[PDB]
Design a protein around this ligand. Structure first.
Ligand SMILES: O=C1C[C@@](O)(C(=O)O)C[C@@H](O)[C@@H]1O
Ligand SMILES: O=C1C[C@@](O)(C(=O)O)C[C@@H](O)[C@@H]1O
Lengths: 257, 257
């Protein structure tokens, strides 16, 4: 993959994240290899840019062989889209829990497989562990989306910016933050932080969102405010506020014009 | 017309402004009677809710009979959409100048015609004459959109809110403000003022917009943030940032559903 600090872009495959209209990410959440393959097949007909595999939804996550088998199955079905490997931790709202060591080993195994283009690492996993794993990913030509989630509130704009800057400091290729609005003002706080980060500090693409139906604007206005990607739902949403993939592309295309 | 402070609505004909998805306004901008008639024909296959006649684009505005005939010509083409009579003053970006007295007489004549459902009165016309004209419009069953426009900058949110509050105080059925963003933050300023005024405070619908391409998101997000209507373009836009009416309705429907 490539990255430019001037264009503030990350290029994975031929996809240029940070240029033009925001890119669409869709999450695959199957429990079994059968569910993963059927979802992948169904998704192939959809118009998205990046496939996020939510590995925390996978029952056999603790069996190394099974994870590799599922990654391979996805790659065989969805052959022309970057594959993002994401174990969302229990701490940050994931479907199952792993020790820090297990979580880092899981991500290292994904990097080593050569089957995934990007991995998601959580900002608050631990500095030593994050830096070591970012380095390992980079040594293997795998990009890192570094993430943070607040499912119950929206921190101050200053705190949101501080977290995004810390992700940059840790070597994140793409800093990403998702927060929960409790008011309409909270949605605008997330957008304010997005504009501030993108205009003042970012030298790479960032991804931001205010969850829930109230925060939907944050999933649509990335081109003007400075969010490089957005999540859409093919069937079931991976988080509240996501709109259908078809509708999402329609809105982004309208805004790009 | 009707109006309710329960649901913060204004009902003109069967159209309920302030309920559900934002309503769409399009502007008619012809120089002569036959120009406005031809434009009205062009607009008839478009999906919009309210027809704004931009009377300041009309060459013979000082000839009362000409203005009446033009209003009549419009109503011959467009029979199923409320007609909003708007002379945008030179001071606020209009295409020609009229004295305050001429402007007030023009609006009173529009009210008397029985051909217009609504009139636009500018907040900064003069408080006393605005109050008197609002009273006259109301006595003749004509609703009033009270407006303010800043085509060059975005005032502070507190100032935007003060203006919207003053419009309520002066009797506006629908306060309306349009401002010009010079930075991305300015768009957020306009949305912030929209929420501050509208959310659990205003007792009637309001219309707000951040103009230009940078502010287009403000024309789409009214259902969440609190703007009851939005302007689109059929052929030529009447202000920078308006997108096609078809595209506008597409996004509004996506966000309502
Ligand atoms: O980080 C994100 C963001 C997300 O939470 C959203 O709100 O769209 C959806 C998750 O699957 C993904 O890992
Ligand atoms: O008040 C408005 C708003 C507007 O300026 C706009 O930005 O859509 C278009 C004008 O025709 C109308 O009178």
């Amino acid at each position: 993959y490539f990255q430019s600090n001037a264009m503030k872009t990350v290029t994975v495959r031929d996809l240029v994240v940070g240029e033009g209209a925001p890119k669409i990410i869709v999450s695959l959440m199957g429990k079994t290899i059968t569910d993963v393959k059927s979802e992948a097949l169904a998704y192939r007909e959809a118009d998205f840019d990046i496939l996020e595999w939510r590995v925390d939804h996978f029952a056999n996550v603790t069996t190394a062989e099974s994870v590799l088998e599922a990654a391979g199955a996805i790659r065989e079905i969805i052959t022309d889209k970057p594959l993002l490997f994401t174990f969302r931790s229990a701490k940050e709202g994931g479907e199952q829990a792993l020790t820090t060591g297990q979580y880092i080993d899981l991500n290292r195994a994904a990097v080593d497989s050569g089957l995934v283009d990007m991995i998601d690492l959580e900002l608050f996993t631990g500095d030593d562990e994050v830096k070591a794993t970012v380095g390992y990913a980079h040594q293997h030509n795998v990009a890192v989306i570094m993430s943070n989630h607040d499912f119950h509130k929206t921190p101050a704009a200053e705190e949101i910016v501080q977290r995004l800057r810390k992700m940059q400091e840790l070597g994140a290729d793409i800093p990403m933050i998702a927060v929960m609005p409790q008011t309409k003002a909270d949605v605008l706080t997330l957008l304010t932080a997005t504009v501030e980060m993108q205009e003042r500090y970012a030298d790479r693409p960032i991804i931001t969102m205010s969850m829930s139906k109230t925060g939907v604007i944050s999933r649509l206005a990335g081109e003007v405010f400075g969010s490089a990607a957005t999540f859409g739902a093919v069937k079931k949403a991976s988080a509240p506020g996501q709109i259908s993939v078809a509708d999402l592309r329609t809105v982004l295309t309208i805004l790009h014009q």
